[PDB]
Design a protein around this nucleic acid. Sequence first.
RNA 1: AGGACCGAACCGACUAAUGUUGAAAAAUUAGCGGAUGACUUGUGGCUGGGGGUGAAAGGCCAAUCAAACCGGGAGAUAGCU
RNA 2: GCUCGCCGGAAGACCAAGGGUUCCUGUCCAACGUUAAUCGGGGCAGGGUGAGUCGACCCCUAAGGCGAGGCCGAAAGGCGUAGUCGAUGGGAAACAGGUUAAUAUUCCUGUACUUGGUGUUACUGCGAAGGGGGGACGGAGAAGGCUAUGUUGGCCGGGCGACGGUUGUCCCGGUUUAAGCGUGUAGGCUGGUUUUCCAGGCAAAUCCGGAAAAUCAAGGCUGAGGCGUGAUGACGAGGCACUACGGUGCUGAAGCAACAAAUGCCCUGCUUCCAGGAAAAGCCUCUAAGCAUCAGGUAACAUCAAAUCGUACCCCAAACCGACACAGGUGGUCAGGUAGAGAAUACCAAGGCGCUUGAGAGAACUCGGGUGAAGGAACUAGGCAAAAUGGUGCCGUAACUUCGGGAGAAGGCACGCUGAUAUGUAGGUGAGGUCCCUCGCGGAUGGAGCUGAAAUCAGUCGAAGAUACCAGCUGGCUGCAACUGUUUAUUAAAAACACAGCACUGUGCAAACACGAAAGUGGACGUAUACGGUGUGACGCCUGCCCGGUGCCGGAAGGUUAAUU
RNA 3: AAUUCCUUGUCGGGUAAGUUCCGACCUGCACGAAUGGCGUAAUGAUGGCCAGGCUGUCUCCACCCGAGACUCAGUGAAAUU
RNA 4: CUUUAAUGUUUGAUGUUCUAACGUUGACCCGUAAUCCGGGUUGCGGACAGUGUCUGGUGGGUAGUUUGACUGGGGCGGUCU
Length: 271
Amino acid sequence: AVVKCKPTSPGRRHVVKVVNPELHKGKPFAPLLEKNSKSGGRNNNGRITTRHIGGGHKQAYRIVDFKRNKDGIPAVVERLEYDPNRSANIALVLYKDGERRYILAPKGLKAGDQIQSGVDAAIKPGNTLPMRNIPVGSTVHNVEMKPGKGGQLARSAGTYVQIVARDGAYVTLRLRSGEMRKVEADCRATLGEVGNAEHMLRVLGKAGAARWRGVRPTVRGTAMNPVDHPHGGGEGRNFGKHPVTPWGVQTKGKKTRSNKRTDKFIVRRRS
RNA sequence: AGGACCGAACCGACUAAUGUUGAAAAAUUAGCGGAUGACUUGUGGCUGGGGGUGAAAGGCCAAUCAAACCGGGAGAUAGCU
RNA sequence: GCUCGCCGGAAGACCAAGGGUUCCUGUCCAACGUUAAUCGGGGCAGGGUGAGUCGACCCCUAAGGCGAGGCCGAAAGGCGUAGUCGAUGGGAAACAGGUUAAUAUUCCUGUACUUGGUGUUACUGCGAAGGGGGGACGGAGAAGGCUAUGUUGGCCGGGCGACGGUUGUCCCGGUUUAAGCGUGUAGGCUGGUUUUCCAGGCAAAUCCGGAAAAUCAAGGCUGAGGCGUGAUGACGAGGCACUACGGUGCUGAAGCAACAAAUGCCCUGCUUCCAGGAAAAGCCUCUAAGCAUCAGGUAACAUCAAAUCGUACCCCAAACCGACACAGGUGGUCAGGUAGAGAAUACCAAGGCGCUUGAGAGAACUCGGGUGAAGGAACUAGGCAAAAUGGUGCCGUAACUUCGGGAGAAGGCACGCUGAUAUGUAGGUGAGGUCCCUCGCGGAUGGAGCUGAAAUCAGUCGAAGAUACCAGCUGGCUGCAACUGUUUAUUAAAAACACAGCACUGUGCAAACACGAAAGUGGACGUAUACGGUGUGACGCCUGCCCGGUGCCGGAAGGUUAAUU
RNA sequence: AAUUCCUUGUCGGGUAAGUUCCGACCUGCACGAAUGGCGUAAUGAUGGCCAGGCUGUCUCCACCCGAGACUCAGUGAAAUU
RNA sequence: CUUUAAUGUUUGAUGUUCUAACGUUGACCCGUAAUCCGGGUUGCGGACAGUGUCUGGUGGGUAGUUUGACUGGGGCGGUCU
């Protein structure tokens, strides 16, 4: 649930929280956890590859099951759980065989609901089947791009795709980006939308709330000296040139997609 | 509950005086600011010079930075002293 | 040696880091010490550092490093797997007292414990580079139960006061005692037990997990402290004998209780919030291959072993880092008394110092301070500096406002001491006894004793009762930025930089982008409610006109146009 | 106006007297709407201005307490030339 | 030898299809108690992609350099035979 806190102090007027009581107020299933040390935006060479990364709260990685290869074995939901490594919530399930696993939380799932994977599974949210058997015009999430590796699309808080057509060994999809992409007609996909849509309405309210996420301040460039950035400086606010990243790239329309390898599944890229 | 209030430790360094071959190659005295947090700190580790890092001042990188230090090319060149 | 004065949340005590004999004794005074020097962190000689339990080594691992093969690269060499290293983390065990000129939980006395080895006996399914559990973990907050510790009383010993009084409600001192073993409480978590089945735990599995039944609810785990033992001992104020007044033997009384009470323990708990909170081994289990009249394993007793290195001394400093015996900087532990909200502050205890030139004089001027006639910012670039305000409780408190604030607004009154209310109250604590009882560290009752506010009434002293130290100046108009913050170490802390928020834009995952001749890595073990970049900069009302120029995004008939032929 | 050269613009407020401050007028030398415009409570060691109280800031300094200065003894520099 | 159609064959262009090169930061198995790597099986792509040589354009992202003299100081202007 979304709630607007009161302005009892500068730093809480425009803050907004997303409170969900369905989440388990305790410790998670340890057997599915592992170490995850932050990187600060650096690489094996110790150099900063991506800026604005550093600090924040500690984190543990919940091993999620994105493949869903446990076919023909139903499972019930034990409880929901908060996952920091991602924007979406997850679900702790229980298979009849005694095994437990993690998955992404669909829109309206709860505890006690039964789910099943495979080709003969039921057409209901949570269940997983290959798109070869999914009806056209439906909504799914956690889509696979190559059979067997695991889902890669529609993994975020409130993201969902829509199957629009299936001709042959391939299926076409309109992604949440408006792009019209096609994939092999054997990839698995989970019905329903990922349920945390109240996440976008969240608000940090103050800078410190960003530093908890591991985000660092972003220096513009205009106020940064000529040696540092193309925008450089000048007495006052001049910026009398074209917008450009460091290293000399426009950043205001210049398409940098230079794949040219697949370039077949793209139909209606966007806009 | 709080990047909340007063205020010691602690971290800072706004004003003034002193000192300026100083007690000190940036400190002291009397006050001041923050003081559960983007806080602070000990240990260890990574990032190496046209590069690093930088809540960005051309700032910091061993009292040295508009391109560190050491050695080498090197007895650079100097129509200038 | 007698006085004085300073610190006393340190200028005291114990360590790490670091230094590396500066420690102790004797001796020397040329040099070193900012003076002298019989002294010294100085010179010379000698002596001194004793560990199964502290620490390191060792076992395990994080960040991260090296990196067999291997991938990559003109060479050098780079990244990295298996693995191996790497604490600032995890992992077995000792306390008290006494003692040396100098060491000690290391020596001695006394009392204990831990891990292994071997052997005897008895009972026995043992076995892993594997599986599972466990180890294993955040912030804030809230109390409650305890202790360290302290105060008072009582007891014991001693004392009767240089000057009035002091045999009493008088004065001083002491009233200490551990780990360990046993009890297993306050209180906290958990429902157990037996049988049966199974697509799982890379194979197995009595274990874990899951499912279905029956049967019982009391079962277990954790757990400060207290109590008892440890302890007929040790210590102990003080005496008796030696006593070179340098010390040694022996003796050695009381050694209880109440109250207060921690930031420390129960607490790695409980409640709660979002930013969602290390790993591995030891340890407890599981079984596989394998070994079974063996071997191994469990318990008891015996006996052996527990090596090696460090241990002195300083450690907020004269010994470390600062060229110096330098107003500097330096992490952790202990945390007394009165007042006090308080680790502030003031005066003190234990303890440790009086900061390595002194004497004298008492001009100008300088520094650091105190007071001030009348006036009260007229000074001055500027109320810079200084002065002043300063605490608690009650009343009371505007504009404006995002309805939280503004606000401690402003402003006003009372504060001491003694006595009574009440021979010390409300409250808190809680003895003895009585009653019960699963008869225990119990429960109910019980209210002695101890402690102890606050307020009221009257009275009283003083110029002044928040008397000292400590301890907000307030108010009004306005520009900038929203705010908390960050910044030019060493002349600039701001209207700059960040910021949440908004928008445009790119990016469909072997993502864009970046570091990299490359491999590969980060981005991200993320997936368009995500990520990167750019600009703007809370919030509120709004963000208008122009695409000729530059650039970007598309489009296509024609024209021009490279290599090549 | 953090933007205004002419300029101490003009009027008025406040002052005995105000090149600054505040509020209006517009002839905007040379504001202008995300290199954002206009307002904005709160906040600020922020800039500017006016009052209350306060005072040695000053009129105009005076006296005193301490460390140096000065004299004696001991040790014993420096820039400069 | 002037001529033009169905052929044989030639090479070029376009499209569709295929797999055997190549790729596979897809799955499974082995080396192997190893998310590297290699090999194998299979699938998806597929002669595209991507790399090398040559080449056009773009290219302050990064370097190397230039940016005159006289002058009643220099610059501006002016001048230079």
